[PDB]
GROMACS .gro file of C-alpha atoms in nm:
model
  212
    1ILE     CA    1   8.319   9.422   9.822
    2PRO     CA    2   8.107   9.509  10.130
    3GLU     CA    3   8.026   9.278  10.418
    4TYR     CA    4   7.646   9.311  10.369
    5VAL     CA    5   7.457   9.362  10.041
    6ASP     CA    6   7.077   9.374  10.005
    7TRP     CA    7   6.945   9.489   9.669
    8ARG     CA    8   6.600   9.536   9.828
    9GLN     CA    9   6.742   9.829  10.024
   10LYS     CA   10   6.870   9.986   9.701
   11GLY     CA   11   6.528   9.976   9.538
   12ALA     CA   12   6.620   9.712   9.280
   13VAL     CA   13   6.385   9.427   9.376
   14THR     CA   14   6.011   9.402   9.302
   15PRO     CA   15   5.753   9.221   9.521
   16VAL     CA   16   5.759   8.846   9.562
   17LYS     CA   17   5.566   8.643   9.309
   18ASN     CA   18   5.406   8.296   9.302
   19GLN     CA   19   5.470   8.075   9.001
   20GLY     CA   20   5.181   7.848   9.104
   21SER     CA   21   5.162   7.489   8.979
   22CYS     CA   22   5.351   7.571   8.655
   23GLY     CA   23   5.720   7.473   8.642
   24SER     CA   24   5.826   7.821   8.538
   25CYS     CA   25   6.097   7.888   8.800
   26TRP     CA   26   6.348   7.943   8.521
   27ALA     CA   27   6.151   8.241   8.388
   28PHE     CA   28   6.090   8.398   8.729
   29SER     CA   29   6.463   8.370   8.809
   30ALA     CA   30   6.562   8.538   8.484
   31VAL     CA   31   6.312   8.821   8.530
   32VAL     CA   32   6.445   8.911   8.874
   33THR     CA   33   6.787   8.973   8.718
   34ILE     CA   34   6.641   9.189   8.437
   35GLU     CA   35   6.440   9.397   8.683
   36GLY     CA   36   6.756   9.452   8.880
   37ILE     CA   37   6.997   9.544   8.600
   38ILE     CA   38   6.753   9.788   8.445
   39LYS     CA   39   6.711   9.970   8.780
   40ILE     CA   40   7.090   9.980   8.825
   41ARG     CA   41   7.149  10.124   8.480
   42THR     CA   42   6.851  10.359   8.436
   43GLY     CA   43   6.726  10.446   8.787
   44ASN     CA   44   6.380  10.302   8.725
   45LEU     CA   45   6.235   9.987   8.881
   46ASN     CA   46   5.978   9.812   8.662
   47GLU     CA   47   5.827   9.462   8.660
   48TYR     CA   48   5.889   9.253   8.347
   49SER     CA   49   5.713   8.954   8.200
   50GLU     CA   50   5.770   8.599   8.310
   51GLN     CA   51   5.480   8.494   8.083
   52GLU     CA   52   5.652   8.617   7.770
   53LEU     CA   53   5.956   8.396   7.841
   54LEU     CA   54   5.730   8.102   7.916
   55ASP     CA   55   5.546   8.146   7.584
   56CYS     CA   56   5.837   8.253   7.365
   57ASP     CA   57   6.153   8.062   7.468
   58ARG     CA   58   6.112   7.749   7.255
   59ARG     CA   59   6.441   7.609   7.390
   60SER     CA   60   6.266   7.572   7.727
   61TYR     CA   61   5.965   7.349   7.795
   62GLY     CA   62   5.706   7.594   7.929
   63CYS     CA   63   5.549   7.470   8.253
   64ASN     CA   64   5.755   7.153   8.229
   65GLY     CA   65   6.077   7.335   8.304
   66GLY     CA   66   6.340   7.541   8.128
   67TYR     CA   67   6.676   7.715   8.134
   68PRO     CA   68   6.751   8.059   8.281
   69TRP     CA   69   7.038   8.106   8.037
   70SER     CA   70   6.811   8.056   7.733
   71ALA     CA   71   6.556   8.303   7.873
   72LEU     CA   72   6.831   8.555   7.925
   73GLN     CA   73   6.963   8.495   7.570
   74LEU     CA   74   6.614   8.559   7.437
   75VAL     CA   75   6.598   8.898   7.614
   76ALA     CA   76   6.937   8.996   7.473
   77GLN     CA   77   6.821   8.927   7.120
   78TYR     CA   78   6.460   9.029   7.114
   79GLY     CA   79   6.381   9.217   7.434
   80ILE     CA   80   6.101   9.189   7.695
   81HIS     CA   81   5.768   9.352   7.777
   82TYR     CA   82   5.638   9.503   8.103
   83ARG     CA   83   5.453   9.260   8.334
   84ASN     CA   84   5.133   9.466   8.309
   85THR     CA   85   5.138   9.437   7.929
   86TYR     CA   86   5.202   9.063   7.934
   87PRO     CA   87   5.084   8.939   8.274
   88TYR     CA   88   5.131   8.598   8.429
   89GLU     CA   89   4.866   8.336   8.352
   90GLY     CA   90   5.036   8.021   8.483
   91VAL     CA   91   4.992   7.819   8.167
   92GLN     CA   92   5.187   7.825   7.845
   93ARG     CA   93   5.007   7.987   7.553
   94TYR     CA   94   5.128   8.123   7.219
   95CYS     CA   95   5.402   8.383   7.192
   96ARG     CA   96   5.231   8.722   7.185
   97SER     CA   97   5.529   8.956   7.185
   98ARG     CA   98   5.454   9.106   6.850
   99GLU     CA   99   5.087   9.167   6.905
  100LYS     CA  100   5.168   9.353   7.223
  101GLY     CA  101   5.387   9.617   7.057
  102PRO     CA  102   5.746   9.730   7.097
  103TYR     CA  103   5.957   9.573   7.370
  104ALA     CA  104   5.995   9.767   7.696
  105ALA     CA  105   6.359   9.672   7.769
  106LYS     CA  106   6.648   9.493   7.604
  107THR     CA  107   6.981   9.356   7.734
  108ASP     CA  108   7.313   9.314   7.557
  109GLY     CA  109   7.423   8.969   7.656
  110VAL     CA  110   7.457   8.699   7.920
  111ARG     CA  111   7.750   8.584   8.129
  112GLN     CA  112   7.814   8.283   8.348
  113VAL     CA  113   7.973   8.310   8.686
  114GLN     CA  114   8.267   8.077   8.737
  115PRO     CA  115   8.111   7.770   8.891
  116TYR     CA  116   8.191   7.609   9.224
  117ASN     CA  117   8.342   7.931   9.356
  118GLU     CA  118   8.182   8.120   9.642
  119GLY     CA  119   8.392   8.433   9.599
  120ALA     CA  120   8.313   8.463   9.233
  121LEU     CA  121   7.938   8.449   9.313
  122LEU     CA  122   7.963   8.710   9.593
  123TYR     CA  123   8.151   8.945   9.361
  124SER     CA  124   7.874   8.912   9.104
  125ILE     CA  125   7.600   8.966   9.361
  126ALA     CA  126   7.780   9.278   9.480
  127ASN     CA  127   7.733   9.416   9.126
  128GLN     CA  128   7.374   9.298   9.053
  129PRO     CA  129   7.117   9.026   9.121
  130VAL     CA  130   7.216   8.689   8.983
  131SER     CA  131   7.024   8.382   8.864
  132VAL     CA  132   7.126   8.071   9.063
  133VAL     CA  133   7.002   7.711   9.097
  134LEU     CA  134   6.966   7.481   9.399
  135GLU     CA  135   6.809   7.149   9.503
  136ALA     CA  136   6.456   7.224   9.628
  137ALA     CA  137   6.311   6.871   9.621
  138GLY     CA  138   6.383   6.788   9.985
  139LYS     CA  139   6.116   6.836  10.247
  140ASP     CA  140   6.343   7.047  10.460
  141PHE     CA  141   6.372   7.311  10.186
  142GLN     CA  142   6.001   7.290  10.113
  143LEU     CA  143   5.896   7.348  10.476
  144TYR     CA  144   6.153   7.620  10.545
  145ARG     CA  145   6.001   7.890  10.764
  146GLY     CA  146   6.298   8.105  10.851
  147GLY     CA  147   6.651   8.135  10.975
  148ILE     CA  148   6.984   8.050  10.812
  149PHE     CA  149   6.921   7.732  10.617
  150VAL     CA  150   7.190   7.467  10.630
  151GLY     CA  151   7.000   7.171  10.483
  152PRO     CA  152   6.972   6.885  10.489
  153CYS     CA  153   6.990   6.886  10.112
  154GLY     CA  154   7.199   6.722   9.839
  155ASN     CA  155   7.336   6.885   9.521
  156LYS     CA  156   7.080   6.759   9.264
  157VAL     CA  157   6.980   7.097   9.149
  158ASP     CA  158   6.625   7.136   9.024
  159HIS     CA  159   6.499   7.488   9.098
  160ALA     CA  160   6.605   7.832   8.968
  161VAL     CA  161   6.590   8.134   9.197
  162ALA     CA  162   6.773   8.466   9.232
  163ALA     CA  163   7.042   8.587   9.464
  164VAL     CA  164   6.976   8.944   9.576
  165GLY     CA  165   7.221   8.993   9.862
  166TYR     CA  166   7.450   8.832  10.117
  167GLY     CA  167   7.592   8.879  10.466
  168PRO     CA  168   7.877   8.729  10.671
  169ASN     CA  169   7.724   8.382  10.691
  170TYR     CA  170   7.454   8.367  10.423
  171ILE     CA  171   7.339   8.440  10.070
  172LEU     CA  172   6.995   8.606  10.036
  173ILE     CA  173   6.761   8.445   9.781
  174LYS     CA  174   6.427   8.557   9.631
  175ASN     CA  175   6.204   8.255   9.563
  176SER     CA  176   5.888   8.239   9.354
  177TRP     CA  177   5.659   8.042   9.588
  178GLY     CA  178   5.466   8.339   9.725
  179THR     CA  179   5.497   8.551  10.032
  180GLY     CA  180   5.390   8.280  10.278
  181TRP     CA  181   5.702   8.068  10.225
  182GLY     CA  182   6.020   8.127  10.416
  183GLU     CA  183   6.111   8.478  10.529
  184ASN     CA  184   5.825   8.663  10.352
  185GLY     CA  185   5.923   8.477  10.032
  186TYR     CA  186   6.301   8.483  10.083
  187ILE     CA  187   6.555   8.234  10.213
  188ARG     CA  188   6.895   8.293  10.369
  189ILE     CA  189   7.123   7.997  10.280
  190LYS     CA  190   7.444   7.938  10.471
  191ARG     CA  191   7.774   8.025  10.305
  192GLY     CA  192   8.133   7.972  10.401
  193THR     CA  193   8.114   7.595  10.464
  194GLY     CA  194   8.396   7.503  10.227
  195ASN     CA  195   8.170   7.275  10.020
  196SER     CA  196   8.257   7.371   9.660
  197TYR     CA  197   7.915   7.279   9.532
  198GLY     CA  198   7.755   7.518   9.779
  199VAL     CA  199   7.476   7.437  10.023
  200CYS     CA  200   7.203   7.260   9.823
  201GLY     CA  201   7.426   7.291   9.512
  202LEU     CA  202   7.400   7.672   9.510
  203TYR     CA  203   7.722   7.733   9.315
  204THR     CA  204   7.640   7.494   9.030
  205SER     CA  205   7.512   7.721   8.748
  206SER     CA  206   7.481   8.098   8.783
  207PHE     CA  207   7.414   8.357   8.519
  208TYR     CA  208   7.357   8.731   8.491
  209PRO     CA  209   7.248   8.969   8.216
  210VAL     CA  210   7.487   9.224   8.068
  211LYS     CA  211   7.362   9.574   7.988
  212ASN     CA  212   7.571   9.869   7.870
   0.00000   0.00000   0.00000
C-alpha cells in the first residue's frame, strides 16, 4: 500500500456536512463510506441520505445515538436514496423510503476491520473509506483547530466518523461538525504510537460496506 492516500484527490469524497444538535454521527459516518464505495465501483460521485438512516434504522436511537454497523446492514438489505430526494432535517421523523420511490443505490454486505490493529485499518483505507469511532468528549478534541492531533484523549469512544486517507504519521478523518471545525472539517490524528487502542480509541470498531 502507498505511503500517502487521500480519497478526496480521487474524487470519492463529498463536501463536509454538519449534523447539528442531533446525535446522528453514526448515520453521517455510514454515508461517507457508501458515497465512497459507489464512486469506486461505478465512477460516479453522489450524495446519499443520512436522514433516511436516521428515520429507518430502528436498531439505532435516532438523534439519541446509533450504530454505524446497523446503518450499513440496512443499506445492504434495503438500499438508500439520494440526499436531494431525502434531505437532512436534523430531527427524527417517520421512515419515508417507500413514498420516495425506488432506492438509488444498494450494497451487498458489511465487514469489520480487525480491531486494535493499525495495519489492518490502513490496508482497508487504502481500498476505500472506512467508518471508525473515537472519543470526542474531551475539550481538546472539541477545540481542535488544526495540525496532527495527539490528544489528550482517553479511549472511551463516543463519536463515529470516517477515515478517508492517511500519511506517514497520521490518519485523515472527515467529521460531521461543519466546515469551521478543524482543518476545513477534517482532522489528522497521529498514528504509529504503538498504542493498540489507537489515539482517542481510533482502532476500536471499524466497518466498511462491501459492493460487488
